[PDB]
Amino acid sequence: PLCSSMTIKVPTDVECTINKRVVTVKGKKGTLVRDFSHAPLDITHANDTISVAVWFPRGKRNALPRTICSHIENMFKGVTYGFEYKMRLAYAHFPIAATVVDNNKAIEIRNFMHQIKTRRIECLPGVTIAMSTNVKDELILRGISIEDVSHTAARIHESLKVPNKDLRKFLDGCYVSSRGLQEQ
Amino acid sequence: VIDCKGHILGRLSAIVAKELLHGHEVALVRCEKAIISGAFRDVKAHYLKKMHKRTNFNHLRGPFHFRAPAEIVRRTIRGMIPYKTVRGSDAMSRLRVYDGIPPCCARYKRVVCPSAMAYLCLRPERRRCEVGRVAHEIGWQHAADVERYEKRRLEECDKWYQDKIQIDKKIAEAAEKDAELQRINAELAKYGY
Amino acid sequence: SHRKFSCCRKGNLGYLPRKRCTRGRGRCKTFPPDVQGAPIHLTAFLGYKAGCTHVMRFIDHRGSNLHNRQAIDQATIIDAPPMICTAIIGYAKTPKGLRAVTTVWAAHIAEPAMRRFYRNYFHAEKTAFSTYMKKAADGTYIKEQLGRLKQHADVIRIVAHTQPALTPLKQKKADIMEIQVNGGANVAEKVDYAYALMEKPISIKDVFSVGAQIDTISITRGRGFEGVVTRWGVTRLPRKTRRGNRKVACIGAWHPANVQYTVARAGQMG
Amino acid sequence: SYHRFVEAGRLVYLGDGPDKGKLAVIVDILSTAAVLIDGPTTGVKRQVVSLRWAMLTDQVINISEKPTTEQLKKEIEASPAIDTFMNSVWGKKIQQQRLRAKATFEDMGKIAKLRRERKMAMKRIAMSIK
Amino acid sequence: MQKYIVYGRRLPSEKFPEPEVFRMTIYAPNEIVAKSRFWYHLKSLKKIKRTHGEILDCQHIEENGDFVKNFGVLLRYRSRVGQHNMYREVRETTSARAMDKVYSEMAGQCRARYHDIQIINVKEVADEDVRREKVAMFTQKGVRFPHPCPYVHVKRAARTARFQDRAPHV
């Protein structure tokens, strides 16, 4: 008789539909689809309040209701307001040069520690890379999916790595200034 | 003829091996979709570990390892069969193992063994992986080919289904006949079947 | 105990078994990749090695001692007589691999290709292709087979024969080989290109370009039974060694109690 | 987990046990893996049976708490659920399955011939349609 | 498993004309185990060995199974490290049935056999006092839970019917 249930009130602007464990959220910025068929979940639409509900929560099935609930809420805020990760380039001596090679779909970084290697990072589909005039050496990543934009920003941070040296002494690279929830 | 899609390899093999010893001829299709329980990380290590044992002096005289998902199933059943004996060799001869549904077994009637199937055999939360993916990693090169031919065969099977549906309706219209007497006896004589 | 001193093994185990080649001549096995959307081209040609020459050339390798200098290099001339296409074969990428979807032969096959199909031409029935020429020669039968290849074949190849008469060697039978047609927009475009070349000589200039790199497949020179010093490149033992020095001294350990496939042993050399 | 909950009064079908093949009502939950079942009109006596034997039918009987046996029989008799289940596909099959069990080796012979008459009659019907 | 109230006394002696009659309630599979467990407790508690004592009666108690009742058992068990005390609540129809449930859970989780577990107290706990969450879960009147194991039915049916035309839906 044990159920770990978490209920999230769907925003009126968002229109979402759940078939099986596939949740499809429609929003003003765009439409997103996630699949949670890995976990055993009894997600019930029930108008605004969506109950994830995991029956018989033995051990880590007690963690599934809140994780899935939060993901479906991230989906809601992604397609209503959009996620805006900001990335700050941190040059000590040689200014790293960033160019948006595609239609906001690729970023190329040069002169990182005077490296001849050119790092081109292709963005995940549905995320746009921009350059911010106000901050200076700031990249703006904008998408409707929290994971897609964050994975792109992690890839940019990894693409620029000091090979050896002391990391505590040489602190150069893109380091993610702001988490997001501002623009599509 | 057994569709192996979704069947635990050992549980299916135990059923197949006794059936082959009992003189039944068994043909297995969609062998690539049989499921081995446990994480791919460890299932693949356990298939690489077995491919390590080869006769040091000549590997041509050593244990052979079959990358093919259908030949993996055969080797499993061979372990559960007295192959060295002539009784065992004959039951191995009646086994036919095939990745994908081949043209030879395309129109044969396929049965499933629900006990062997993974959905009833392993808890949800237990990681499981098809033998087709372990095969590709150990070195099977026909996964793309077997998928291309399976997808096109399923498009044809869809067209056949629609014709089958219309044919089945036209059999039901003719299900009125002496069949009614057979029905009366096979139920209303208390027989019940 | 350990080997005491570190030394590599002698020979590539990948080239075992070192046996006389069963295949009559060099075989292509894997052709170059199709690269669909490229220009339609033939990937292979057969020729007979004539001999070497030595040429002086101007090196333009930037970043080298020879940049803007002249070098004398060994060059091998391979006499390549034109090869006449005699048949088109189409293969499909089945779950069991490339499987032939039939070969359509030409309406008229040359005498050198015919000679290949018999052990002795003079004392032979000469019955090969007799029915086929009657079925064909109108082109209708050939066209139906080409259409079947367009519908079911994924890889198109041409079967061509070297004309041995144009070469100095004492052969008379032609060597027949399959040359993969590559660079096709469609399989049917590949069949059309192949049909144009049917019963038609193909030239090296129209297969390969100057400055391009090729892979040369052939059976090597033979030396017959050779010793492990001149077969595997093992060290000759000191001249004090009784019972001869041209031998591997220890062919293995007590355990495994059977000689291994690694250990060097005398046999066929070329 | 959408429907067919293990609740009080749910009609149950015994898949295994001495009373296999019969319907019962869950009088009370003993645990996650056991229930107290009793079916007086179906002849199942009150016992605690593992939920692993019980199969949940779609019908639920409206009963009072602590049903007892006599009050439970009165409630089961009032409910139309028992007959609704029997008229349903599972119930009609359950009735056929009971008749199949009451069959001797001789009644297997008559049932095997009749089945082969069906096998060949169906082939004649199928061929004639085509 | 059966529930036996066993009575026993020391043999009557010139030193004491009527020794004290002792009464214990022992849950055992049979009467011979119940009289053995009686003397094991009597030997330690009152220094009475079986040779020095008599069994006045071993009365078997019959318990009604009409209603599920919350039961509470206080026991002591020996693990390899040393002895420990443990309170377990189980909801069962009869007290013997609840003791069987307690013995099976102790064997399954604590790996303790019948002989190394002594049952200090077995009581019927009220619905209000249920320290164990599991018993408290079913105590509330409305307890709709989806079938815990509907996979078992299809797997069991498939033992007789090894080969089926379709894979069964649960």
Added chain:
Amino acid sequence: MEPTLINLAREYNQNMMICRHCYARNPLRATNCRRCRGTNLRKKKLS
């Protein structure tokens, strides 16, 4: 470098806890290391 940039850079390169046995970068408030599963964490020596 700009001072804020040095701070931001430090969050990912200087602020972490290293379990002595596992030598694994670990969260600042980590009771047990992700890989070593041990309580002997240290605060990462400053430059």
Added chain:
Amino acid sequence: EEIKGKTFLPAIFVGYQRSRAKQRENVALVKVSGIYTRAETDKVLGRLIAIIHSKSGKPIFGKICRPHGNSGMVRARFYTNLPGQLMGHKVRVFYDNI
């Protein structure tokens, strides 16, 4: 034959009754189709069965005697002991008498 019209219930001769060490070739373990339980075997007990000899194409008559195990296999005795090349071959439990 004498079994030409007899309807028969299908079965297989799986093996002789045996232990890993010792095999009793006198009793033959037969699996009867439709019998999956030991109680169900009682229906087929004391029934005339026949296995067609491969060499002569002639039925070897036998009678089912006792149940072999809880899974419905039965122990049967035949006029001649079975050759052993007939393992896995079908035996016929006739629904009609003799």
Added chain:
RNA sequence: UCUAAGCGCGCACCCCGCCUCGCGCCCCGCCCGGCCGCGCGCCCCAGCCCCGUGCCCCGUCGCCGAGCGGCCCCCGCCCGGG
């Protein structure tokens, strides 16, 4: 909070390709025959869409034809030169 679900990257290692061999098999040629079998939905299982069956007779009366799916058959040397 890098992990529990989920996800990205990732080793001179591993596996594969390229290569060395290769049982068999495929296509064609010559020749163009014999033999044998009769039986197709798919997906999913925390929607499981109504389940919890069917088959239960490979001779036991079934064998036509057709359509598919197979199997078999068959291809010399001596001699001279390399």
Added chain:
RNA sequence: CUUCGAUGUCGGCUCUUCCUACCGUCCGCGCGCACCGGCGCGGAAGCGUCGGAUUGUUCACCCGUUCAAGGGAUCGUGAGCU
């Protein structure tokens, strides 16, 4: 314990394979990590671990170089040698 009507005794030379308890190169992480260069750790056995002086010597010590881990296989290897 087994081998005495017999299992060729060390070191070298030759040649093969294997192990990791990895010295260098590979992948990370740490440092009393500015760089250079060390050092510690986890994965990693693909490749390299040589040329000589004295000594029967394994060992040892020394010179030199692209600076040089440790072992196992009847103390691998005598119808192979010396």
Added chain:
RNA sequence: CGGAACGGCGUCGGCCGGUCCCGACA
């Protein structure tokens, strides 16, 4: 999976000492 002292916020089951609506400075 022969195995030790020692570790483990892996998952369960207890034992004991406490604090929760004097919300476990507002």
